[PDB]
Write a protein that binds this ligand. Structure first.
Ligand SMILES: Nc1ncnc2c1ncn2[C@@H]1O[C@H](COP(=O)(O)O)[C@@H](OP(=O)(O)O)[C@H]1O
Ligand SMILES: CC(C)NC[C@@H]1CCc2cc(CO)c([N+](=O)[O-])cc2N1
Length: 256
């Protein structure tokens, strides 16, 4: 097809929870739009200074009215954080999908989903290990190497609570997490008009996404398949071994 000049503003809002193919989608959207897409990896690797800003936003967000003046101050902060990006995925953004829809009325919405038990397994291996899991200690050691500490974990927890609309949450309780997952995904599909929503199951690939976005399928490029828990386990172990990201970054070309 013809090449057109795309606007550098949020065009795609992905409401999918972590461990549902968000990093592959981030990569896919960057392949399509040639501009950056937000993801937790953008925070970890490029903008750790954004952590406190996301924290402050989540703190003030109860004050959001489904526009009031308190709402506008928050919406302005959201726009500031996302300036220069063409899409959002992953925590901490995903819980804000409804607000992002108001801020970017011409953006389309995605929902990434998968088998709930596969999701929980993946989540426990990477994002939210049980407190008694020895692996949690390795994750914390690798996080230290990346310069992530208690503030990062607070952002992860608070943004999960915000997405699930819980004031507190037993993170070690599998049943609680699975119920929140199902209710979260159900609410997105109830909230977003079907014409503005595309639901993507893990493995769906380029075709329905490119159709929804009115773009050609990228020539000769496979749909990304990155960020498996096995790959993150390798990353964690290599970070612990070398004590730096930059010593090993070349060994993870598309993941980071
Ligand atoms: N193109 C693809 N096809 C199938 N699974 C994919 C995929 N891209 C990513 N995934 C899976 O999506 C999960 C990562 O999601 P996210 O980037 O949101 O954290 C991983 O699940 P597993 O940990 O079960 O392997 C990864 O394997
Ligand atoms: C040892 C090192 C590999 N650990 C860092 C990890 C890996 C990637 C990651 C991804 C997400 C959501 O994509 C979240 N999250 O939900 O906040 C936390 C983390 N933390």
């Amino acid at each position: 097809g013809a090449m057109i000049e795309s606007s550098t503003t949020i065009q795609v809002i992905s409401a999918g929870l972590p461990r549902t193919g968000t990093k592959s989608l981030k990569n896919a959207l960057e392949i399509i739009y040639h501009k950056p897409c937000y993801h937790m990896f953008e925070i970890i690797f490029n903008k750790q200074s954004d952590i406190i800003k996301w924290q402050n936003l989540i703190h003030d967000s109860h004050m959001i009215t489904t526009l009031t003046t308190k709402t506008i101050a928050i919406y302005d902060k959201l726009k500031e954080l996302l300036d220069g990006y063409i899409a959002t995925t992953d925590l901490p953004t995903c819980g804000f999908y409804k607000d992002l829809m108001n801020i970017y009325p011409n953006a389309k919405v995605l929902l990434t989903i998968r088998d709930k038990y596969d999701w929980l397994h993946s989540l426990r291996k990477v994002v939210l290990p049980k407190s008694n899991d020895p692996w949690k200690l390795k994750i914390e050691e690798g996080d230290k190497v990346l310069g992530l500490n208690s503030d990062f974990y607070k952002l992860t927890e608070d943004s999960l609570k915000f997405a699930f609309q819980k004031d507190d949450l037993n993170f070690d309780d599998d049943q609680v997490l699975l119920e929140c997952y199902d209710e979260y995904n159900r609410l997105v599909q109830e909230t977003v008009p079907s014409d503005r929503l595309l639901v993507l199951r893990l493995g769906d690939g380029w075709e329905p996404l490119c159709k929804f976005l009115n773009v050609e399928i990228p020539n000769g490029i496979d749909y990304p398949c990155v960020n498996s828990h096995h790959q993150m386990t390798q990353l964690t172990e290599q970070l612990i071994k070398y004590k730096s990201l930059d010593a090993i970054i070349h060994m993870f070309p598309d993941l980071i």
